[PDB]
Design an enzyme around this catalytic site. Structure first.
Site, mmCIF file in Angstrom:
data_model
loop_
_atom_site.group_PDB
_atom_site.id
_atom_site.type_symbol
_atom_site.label_atom_id
_atom_site.label_comp_id
_atom_site.label_asym_id
_atom_site.label_seq_id
_atom_site.Cartn_x
_atom_site.Cartn_y
_atom_site.Cartn_z
ATOM 1 N N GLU A 184 -28.899 17.425 -41.502
ATOM 2 C CA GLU A 184 -28.434 16.066 -41.254
ATOM 3 C C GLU A 184 -28.290 15.874 -39.393
ATOM 4 O O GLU A 184 -28.679 14.864 -38.850
ATOM 5 C CB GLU A 184 -27.088 15.982 -41.669
ATOM 6 C CG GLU A 184 -26.321 14.727 -41.522
ATOM 7 C CD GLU A 184 -24.792 14.472 -41.767
ATOM 8 O OE1 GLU A 184 -24.149 15.492 -41.593
ATOM 9 O OE2 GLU A 184 -24.249 13.537 -42.237
ATOM 10 N N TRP A 239 -26.992 11.954 -48.433
ATOM 11 C CA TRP A 239 -26.958 10.332 -48.076
ATOM 12 C C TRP A 239 -27.580 9.711 -49.241
ATOM 13 O O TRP A 239 -28.092 8.475 -49.013
ATOM 14 C CB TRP A 239 -27.799 10.049 -46.742
ATOM 15 C CG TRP A 239 -26.704 10.561 -45.541
ATOM 16 C CD1 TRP A 239 -26.738 11.285 -44.795
ATOM 17 C CD2 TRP A 239 -25.921 9.302 -44.913
ATOM 18 N NE1 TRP A 239 -26.061 11.293 -43.801
ATOM 19 C CE2 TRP A 239 -25.503 10.017 -43.880
ATOM 20 C CE3 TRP A 239 -25.522 8.205 -45.383
ATOM 21 C CZ2 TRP A 239 -24.424 9.508 -43.167
ATOM 22 C CZ3 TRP A 239 -24.565 7.533 -44.555
ATOM 23 C CH2 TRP A 239 -24.057 8.494 -43.366
ATOM 24 N N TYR A 292 -25.719 6.425 -37.390
ATOM 25 C CA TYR A 292 -25.826 7.669 -36.239
ATOM 26 C C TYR A 292 -27.545 7.966 -36.353
ATOM 27 O O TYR A 292 -28.326 7.974 -37.013
ATOM 28 C CB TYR A 292 -25.269 8.957 -37.111
ATOM 29 C CG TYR A 292 -24.183 8.587 -37.985
ATOM 30 C CD1 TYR A 292 -22.816 8.604 -36.953
ATOM 31 C CD2 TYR A 292 -24.006 8.926 -39.185
ATOM 32 C CE1 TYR A 292 -21.751 8.434 -37.838
ATOM 33 C CE2 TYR A 292 -22.558 8.596 -39.703
ATOM 34 C CZ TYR A 292 -21.550 8.393 -39.085
ATOM 35 O OH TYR A 292 -20.140 8.330 -39.619
ATOM 36 N N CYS A 344 -18.156 7.167 -39.096
ATOM 37 C CA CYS A 344 -17.150 7.756 -39.207
ATOM 38 C C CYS A 344 -16.641 8.610 -37.894
ATOM 39 O O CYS A 344 -15.920 8.347 -37.343
ATOM 40 C CB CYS A 344 -16.930 8.725 -40.467
ATOM 41 S SG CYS A 344 -17.194 7.878 -42.150
ATOM 42 N N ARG A 397 -12.679 8.114 -37.178
ATOM 43 C CA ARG A 397 -11.996 7.079 -37.674
ATOM 44 C C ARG A 397 -11.409 7.341 -38.883
ATOM 45 O O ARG A 397 -10.198 7.092 -39.352
ATOM 46 C CB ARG A 397 -12.580 5.683 -37.691
ATOM 47 C CG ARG A 397 -13.880 5.630 -38.403
ATOM 48 C CD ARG A 397 -14.378 4.237 -38.849
ATOM 49 N NE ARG A 397 -15.256 4.314 -39.960
ATOM 50 C CZ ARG A 397 -15.137 4.386 -41.131
ATOM 51 N NH1 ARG A 397 -13.845 4.284 -41.719
ATOM 52 N NH2 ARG A 397 -16.180 4.592 -41.993
ATOM 53 N N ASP A 405 -12.726 12.468 -44.445
ATOM 54 C CA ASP A 405 -12.400 13.237 -45.944
ATOM 55 C C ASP A 405 -12.427 14.774 -45.927
ATOM 56 O O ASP A 405 -13.314 15.357 -45.642
ATOM 57 C CB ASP A 405 -13.641 12.905 -46.834
ATOM 58 C CG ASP A 405 -13.753 13.424 -48.082
ATOM 59 O OD1 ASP A 405 -12.859 13.988 -48.549
ATOM 60 O OD2 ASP A 405 -14.895 13.538 -48.639
HETATM 61 N N1 LIG Z 1 -17.114 22.192 -51.050
HETATM 62 C C1 LIG Z 1 -18.397 21.810 -51.157
HETATM 63 C C2 LIG Z 1 -19.476 21.098 -50.965
HETATM 64 C C3 LIG Z 1 -20.566 21.799 -51.326
HETATM 65 C C4 LIG Z 1 -22.019 21.313 -51.142
HETATM 66 C C5 LIG Z 1 -22.206 20.017 -50.469
HETATM 67 C C6 LIG Z 1 -23.528 19.500 -50.292
HETATM 68 O O1 LIG Z 1 -23.890 18.384 -50.295
HETATM 69 O O2 LIG Z 1 -24.347 20.403 -50.151
HETATM 70 C C7 LIG Z 1 -21.115 19.325 -49.998
HETATM 71 N N2 LIG Z 1 -21.081 18.191 -49.289
HETATM 72 C C8 LIG Z 1 -21.223 16.898 -49.605
HETATM 73 O O3 LIG Z 1 -21.122 16.620 -50.849
HETATM 74 C C9 LIG Z 1 -21.184 15.914 -48.479
HETATM 75 C C10 LIG Z 1 -20.778 16.299 -47.277
HETATM 76 C C11 LIG Z 1 -20.712 15.381 -46.225
HETATM 77 C C12 LIG Z 1 -21.236 13.884 -46.548
HETATM 78 C C13 LIG Z 1 -21.179 12.945 -45.396
HETATM 79 C C14 LIG Z 1 -20.957 11.523 -46.110
HETATM 80 C C15 LIG Z 1 -21.799 10.427 -46.033
HETATM 81 N N3 LIG Z 1 -21.226 9.279 -46.613
HETATM 82 C C16 LIG Z 1 -19.755 9.828 -47.054
HETATM 83 N N4 LIG Z 1 -19.172 9.011 -47.809
HETATM 84 C C17 LIG Z 1 -17.953 9.787 -48.069
HETATM 85 N N5 LIG Z 1 -17.076 9.022 -48.944
HETATM 86 N N6 LIG Z 1 -17.614 10.833 -47.954
HETATM 87 C C18 LIG Z 1 -18.479 11.913 -47.193
HETATM 88 O O4 LIG Z 1 -18.157 12.963 -47.010
HETATM 89 C C19 LIG Z 1 -19.821 11.274 -46.484
HETATM 90 C C20 LIG Z 1 -21.583 13.811 -47.694
HETATM 91 C C21 LIG Z 1 -21.475 14.437 -48.887
HETATM 92 C C22 LIG Z 1 -19.829 19.936 -50.128
HETATM 93 O O1 LIG Z 2 -18.941 12.468 -41.415
HETATM 94 C C1 LIG Z 2 -18.112 11.844 -42.030
HETATM 95 N N1 LIG Z 2 -16.930 12.538 -42.603
HETATM 96 C C2 LIG Z 2 -16.026 11.715 -43.501
HETATM 97 O O2 LIG Z 2 -15.232 12.314 -43.695
HETATM 98 N N2 LIG Z 2 -16.718 10.698 -44.187
HETATM 99 C C3 LIG Z 2 -15.946 9.842 -45.195
HETATM 100 C C4 LIG Z 2 -14.382 9.577 -44.775
HETATM 101 C C5 LIG Z 2 -14.462 8.474 -46.199
HETATM 102 O O3 LIG Z 2 -14.168 9.114 -47.305
HETATM 103 C C6 LIG Z 2 -15.723 7.606 -46.084
HETATM 104 C C7 LIG Z 2 -15.442 6.551 -45.260
HETATM 105 O O4 LIG Z 2 -15.032 5.479 -45.980
HETATM 106 P P1 LIG Z 2 -14.467 4.135 -44.987
HETATM 107 O O5 LIG Z 2 -16.045 3.592 -44.273
HETATM 108 O O6 LIG Z 2 -13.816 3.159 -45.823
HETATM 109 O O7 LIG Z 2 -13.558 4.872 -44.138
HETATM 110 O O8 LIG Z 2 -16.814 8.712 -45.397
HETATM 111 C C8 LIG Z 2 -17.661 10.254 -43.978
HETATM 112 C C9 LIG Z 2 -18.695 10.748 -42.908
HETATM 113 F F1 LIG Z 2 -19.880 10.414 -42.671
#
Ligand SMILES: N#Cc1ccc(C(=O)O)c(NC(=O)c2ccc(Cc3c[nH]c4nc(N)[nH]c(=O)c34)cc2)c1
Ligand SMILES: O=c1[nH]c(=O)n([C@H]2C[C@H](O)[C@@H](COP(=O)(O)O)O2)cc1F
Ligand SMILES: NC(=O)C1=CN([C@@H]2O[C@H](COP(=O)(O)OP(=O)(O)OC[C@H]3O[C@@H](n4cnc5c(N)ncnc54)[C@H](OP(=O)(O)O)[C@@H]3O)[C@@H](O)[C@H]2O)C=CC1
Ligand SMILES: NC(=O)C1=CN([C@@H]2O[C@H](COP(=O)(O)OP(=O)(O)OC[C@H]3O[C@@H](n4cnc5c(N)ncnc54)[C@H](OP(=O)(O)O)[C@@H]3O)[C@@H](O)[C@H]2O)C=CC1
Ligand SMILES: CN(Cc1cnc2nc(N)nc(N)c2n1)c1ccc(C(=O)N[C@@H](CCC(=O)O)C(=O)O)cc1
Ligand SMILES: CN(Cc1cnc2nc(N)nc(N)c2n1)c1ccc(C(=O)N[C@@H](CCC(=O)O)C(=O)O)cc1
Ligand SMILES: N#Cc1ccc(C(=O)O)c(NC(=O)c2ccc(Cc3c[nH]c4nc(N)[nH]c(=O)c34)cc2)c1
Ligand SMILES: O=c1[nH]c(=O)n([C@H]2C[C@H](O)[C@@H](COP(=O)(O)O)O2)cc1F
Lengths: 506, 506
Positions: A279, A301, A327, A387, A408, A411
């Protein structure tokens, strides 16, 4: 009746301390620590006693240690009286005579082999433990440090240090047996409700505090993440958001991480470092094509780049995984007119990353090393607003590159470890391309939240005592920052707890 | 031999405690504090003794206080034995018989009038002092609390609380007469140099620590600024910058401030609040004409808007005080093509402030309430790039508005107090326009520095013990955020230390 402390250096998992009559490593700072901790005395007219077994006495060349008295436990060694700094005892119990008589000995240090440690703990003579955890486990051991009995509790865990690409910690274990200010604060908190700001930032209860016995020595910087988890679990307000999964949220937090002697990759959970790197290099290359990550088996993604999600947020005209200007498009082509992910953008927009590198290696003490992703003009075209919004970079006087990040929305279950590791890797790449060393990483968080379907998981993660951070090294020096590949990264000494599955909220 | 504590509520400057046989204020929480601190006991079979003079005994209606024993010092009152909760003594010394005999009394509280306080301190009977500092000074007093003798030191200072627009503090004064973790950390710091991150964040020496006796009770949030000053003085690296005045700089710091019960305007230095407000309303209106501030006798942007400075930074074409697209032009017209300060820009650019207000009062739990000023396309046209770069806003579940601010570069001598007060006022304005109450203010700083010509000044400011924050109230509810005027702001109970002149680096 004086104090007795075990001093030991053991591996992180199997607690190995020796192999073939010698140490399984060569860490100079650990020997310096042994020296400084065994010389630490309060009376200038007293010496410290170092109890050790016979094979350990052979390991150090049978030569005395300066300013200290060595006590060799052996059934065969001659009880010599020629050397006044070395004395022999037939068993470990008789050697504890330093307690009853001999007022010239102040402290006692058990630092012998496995045989001495095991029945120094079995005989319950040990008050303290100075443990040096070393991140080396795929080698051979023949001598182990026994499992620490449940009567001991950790009271200190240092930051992760690095020697010859080997990570190691320093911990203290203690054996378990003014109030006016606290009372005044409690009374003021009883009077004023949530009017007293301290009540909106309550200290986390013990049941949700990682390794609660470590009160004043939470030095290991993984605690910067676990304590944030605990603070959210304690003070997090229950709030609904754009997804169907509600969160517990707080506002305004920060985390610090060292990058000089370690890499801030969480050890309480196995983190997918490869997806993070892919990424990040996807960002650096300027790419917004969501398929290039799926082709490399990176599906982070996919949720925010599906046909249903894009049509729901009003981007049905957009192709399947065309995430739009996000990004890496604001990084390399800021304010650039976005069309599709297939068009050529070489030349359009402001190349923030290139100007950042140029300023870092041309004007280091400048206070404007800023990389931004928040573009109000392009927010509507994005599949998801940025974010990790803003980042600033700083060159210290000793040629180190530190990084600050304002995010901002965080998670803490999934996004936070990814962000930590990702911006650590980015700072390291910038440091190599600009000719610096990695410095520190500060993350400033607005809406720090925990999704309610992660609770059972995250509490589990809080039950695991952290292990020393690994190391991350680059195998080659690249010419351009875009030239980094996954094969160029060596992750040394990463021994995390098993992975914890957590579902992402779409 | 038990503990004796004065309990008193006095004004901040003149230490007045009474007028015409009654108190000069009516603060209910202070009476609740008195009750909870005088009832605070450890034995359920013992009572606490409250010593007071005869006029004070009249002030409370000559009626006993529940669960406590009142001791009236008087030469004329009959030593009655009918009331077992009220006892009379002829002098203060004889009343201290509670120490020698009468084991049913646990603690002793001196809370009488000026006559009792003055010779309870003169006779050296007092161990502790619970002082409630009240911010009321332009009224009449006839009874004062004596000056605290040098044998007492402050150990606690609470946050500023508010009752009926009256600010007040809570302080504790004490009379002046495990180590293993500290030793291990010191030894590790001796081994590793600046490799151990703790050595890059050394605790400030006492000589540069504001009110050093307050160790565990630095609750008052003005300490969030004085401690940052101390940290910069301790760890700040000497660095040259674009100006001829070098700084002592560190990277990655933060400050928290409460805005529910007080207004974070520094008291250790008289701050030009009017200039702060005029600059802020200048931002909100979208103005970049530096003369509009000079016409209102606000000269803070004169240095960065002179003919010589503009010609030096490559803007000789620019008019005298045409600062270019800066704060308030990116707020109201983001990405708008800038010409001069005289043109009409109504309609061009992205109105970030309007969308912010609309999102705040239409979608409060949204995580995108972001106002940015960092525009890479417009940086070259600015007389000075944005220092307070990014801001985020948050609506709590109890309808309060909190604010986070990321600032890339912070002049702690001049810019930092202005920034604190300015973003506090902006959050309050947004809260009134959106129908919320002010919450918290978090400031995250990248390059936090002190200019070398400010040292003598700032050290002076570190010698002044803080006073409770004032209050800031709006006299009327405006219809649009642009309608605020200086006459609409009432600054209640601001009693700062004298101003400290500090020159700005151009
Ligand atoms: N324990 C554990 C563990 C194990 C494997 C994986 C994997 O994928 O290998 C993993 N990671 C994710 O699943 C992941 C991480 C980061 C992102 C970034 C992102 C983009 N858009 C978002 N929207 C919301 N709500 N939340 C977000 O985090 C994001 C999106 C997905 C975590
Ligand atoms: O790098 C990141 N870190 C992160 O914590 N989020 C999570 C935070 C939240 O759960 C969601 C954004 O939702 P919102 O746009 O409403 O703040 O993405 C996404 C990323 F890309
Ligand atoms: N990582 C670390 O912190 C440390 C590692 N080590 C390593 O561990 C290895 C050595 O440990 P280890 O194999 O256990 O050998 P030991 O150091 O424990 O020495 C053993 C000897 O001590 C004597 N001894 C032990 N127990 C008794 C007893 N109950 N009564 C009488 N005598 C006793 C015996 O001597 P005898 O036969 O003469 O009677 C025995 O042979 C080495 O590789 C060393 O380098 C050692 C110290 C610290
Ligand atoms: N803000 C706060 O925390 C407090 C404020 N106050 C205010 O202060 C005012 C009252 O204080 P103040 O005017 O000083 O009156 P006092 O409360 O000090 O009472 C004075 C009386 O105490 C007796 N007395 C005092 N000293 C002696 C002595 N050395 N020997 C014998 N008797 C003595 C005398 O009574 P006698 O003539 O009968 O012999 C004297 O008249 C009130 O307005 C009250 O509201 C009071 C308490 C707390
Ligand atoms: C018993 N033993 C094995 C050994 C090796 N590493 C350890 N490491 C730790 N953390 N704890 C131990 N008990 C320990 N023991 C020792 C003890 C001392 C020296 C030694 O040479 N000490 C010098 C070290 C001098 C230095 O390098 O500065 C000293 O002055 O104490 C070597 C091996
Ligand atoms: C002597 N005196 C004057 C007075 C007023 N404010 C003070 N404030 C402080 N901080 N300290 C004092 N000694 C003090 N004294 C008093 C003492 C008690 C009460 C009183 O009514 N106390 C009730 C308060 C009940 C409450 O409001 O809940 C109690 O339970 O103690 C009023 C005036
Ligand atoms: N004690 C005290 C005290 C007393 C009176 C005043 C006053 O003016 O009434 C005052 N304030 C300033 O002088 C001031 C404050 C804020 C600013 C904002 C700013 C714009 N450009 C900058 N460049 C650099 N280097 N530093 C900066 O702070 C800025 C510029 C000037 C301080
Ligand atoms: O609101 C402000 N806050 C602030 O701290 N400065 C100072 C910080 C720095 O000392 C100077 C210029 O920063 P730089 O040299 O990075 O352009 O302005 C300026 C402001 F307008």
């Amino acid at each position: 009746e004086k104090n007795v402390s075990i001093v030991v250096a053991a591996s992180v998992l199997s607690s190995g301390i020796g192999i073939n009559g010698q140490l399984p490593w060569s860490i100079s700072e650990d020997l310096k620590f042994f020296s400084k901790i065994t010389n630490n005395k309060c009376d200038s007219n007293k010496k410290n006693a170092l109890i050790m077994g016979r094979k350990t006495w052979d390991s150090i060349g049978r030569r005395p240690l300066k300013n200290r008295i060595i006590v060799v436990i052996s059934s065969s060694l001659p009880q010599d009286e020629a050397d006044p700094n070395v004395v022999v005892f037939r068993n470990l119990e008789d050697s504890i005579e330093n307690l009853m008589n001999d007022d010239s000995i102040e402290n006692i240090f058990v630092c012998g082999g496995e045989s001495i440690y095991r029945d120094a703990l079995k005989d319950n003579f040990v008050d303290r433990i100075y443990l040096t955890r070393v991140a080396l486990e795929d080698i051979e051991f023949d001598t182990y440090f026994p499992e620490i009995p449940e009567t001991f509790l950790p009271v200190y865990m240092s930051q992760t240090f690095c020697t010859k690409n080997i990570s190691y910690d320093f911990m203290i274990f203690e054996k378990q047996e003014l109030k006016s200010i606290d009372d005044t604060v409690d009374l003021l908190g009883e009077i004023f409700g949530i009017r007293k700001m301290g009540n909106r930032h309550k200290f986390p209860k013990e049941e949700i505090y990682n390794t609660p016995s470590i009160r004043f020595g939470r030095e290991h910087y993984e605690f910067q993440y676990l304590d944030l988890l605990s603070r959210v679990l304690e003070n997090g307000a229950y709030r609904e958001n754009r997804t169907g999964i509600s969160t517990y949220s707080i506002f305004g937090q920060m985390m610090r991480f060292d990058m000089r002697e370690s890499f801030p990759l969480l050890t309480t959970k196995k983190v997918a470092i490869r997806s993070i790197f892919e990424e990040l290099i996807w960002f650096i290359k300027g790419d917004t094509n969501g398929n290039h990550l799926i082709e490399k088996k990176v599906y982070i993604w996919s949720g925010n780049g599906s046909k249903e999600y894009l049509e729901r947020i009003g981007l049905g005209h957009r192709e399947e995984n065309d995430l739009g200007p996000i990004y890496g498009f604001q990084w390399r082509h800021y304010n650039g007119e976005y069309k599709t992910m297939h068009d050529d953008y070489t030349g359009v927009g402001v190349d923030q990353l290139a100007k950042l590198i140029e300023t870092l290696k041309n004007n280091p003490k400048d206070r404007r090393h800023i990389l931004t992703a928040w573009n109000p003009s392009a927010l509507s075209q994005m599949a998801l607003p940025p974010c990790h919004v803003l980042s600033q970079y700083y060159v210290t006087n000793d040629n180190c590159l530190s990084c600050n990040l304002y995010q901002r929305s965080c998670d803490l279950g999934l996004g936070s470890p990814f962000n930590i590791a990702s911006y650590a890797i980015l700072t390291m790449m910038l440091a190599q391309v600009c000719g610096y060393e990695p410095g520190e990483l500060a993350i400033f968080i607005g809406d720090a939240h925990i999704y309610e379907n992660h609770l059972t998981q995250l509490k589990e993660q809080l039950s695991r005592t952290p292990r020393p951070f690994p190391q991350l090294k680059f195998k080659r020096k690249v010419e351009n920052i875009e030239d980094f590949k996954w094969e160029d990264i060596e992750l040394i000494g990463y021994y995390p707890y098993p992975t914890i599955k957590m579902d992402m909220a779409v």
